[PDB]
Design a protein around this ligand. Structure first.
Ligand SMILES: [Mg+2]
Lengths: 8, 165
């Protein structure tokens, strides 16, 4: 599973 | 909001790279990517630049011996970091790149990264090991007046950004 993108 | 948004805003936006992707260090396979292009343009295929499922190639050595090799693209990324060489070159999206250089713990403004560079006809790529067990893949195209050095700085800046999160 890919990680979540960092917050903007 | 996705990795695409983030790659696009933070990296593609620089105009220094033709494409960028993120791969897991577990298998070296790209799980997210962006590319310059006019989406949509019915017909831009960002994934063909970053991914191709395993394929056989025919190879002839200097003795004229022909054999067949299965290329797993992800493994060709990992081998460079793991071993410091590429037995078959680095393959990405069906395209062969020549492994040119690796630097370990290259220092960039307070953060250290392992960075590999590969070249092809009028372009190339950089591979950067980045936080969270990831590898950044950045492409440059010299036909677009992008260059090896500027694309590397773009990749390093993005990596530093990630490290800063
Ligand atoms: Mg070989």
């Amino acid at each position: 599973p890919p990680p979540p993108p960092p917050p903007p | 909001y996705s990795w695409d948004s983030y790659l696009n805003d933070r990296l593609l936006a620089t105009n220094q790279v033709s494409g960028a992707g993120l791969a897991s260090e577990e298998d070296g396979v790209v799980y997210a990517c962006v590319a310059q292009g006019e989406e949509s343009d019915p017909n831009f295929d960002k994934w063909s630049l970053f991914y191709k499922e395993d394929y056989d190639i025919e190879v002839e050595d200097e003795n004229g011996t022909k054999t067949t090799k299965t290329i797993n693209e992800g493994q060709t990324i990992l081998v460079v970091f793991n071993e410091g060489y590429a037995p078959d070159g680095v393959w990405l999206g069906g395209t062969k790149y020549q492994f040119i250089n690796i630097e370990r713990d290259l220092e960039f403004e307070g953060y250290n990264f392992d960075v590999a560079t590969c070249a092809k006809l009028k372009g190339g790529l950089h591979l950067v090991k980045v936080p969270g067990g990831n590898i950044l893949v950045v492409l440059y195209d010299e036909e677009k007046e992008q260059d090896r050095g500027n694309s590397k700085i773009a990749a390093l800046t993005f990596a530093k950004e990630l490290a800063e999160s």
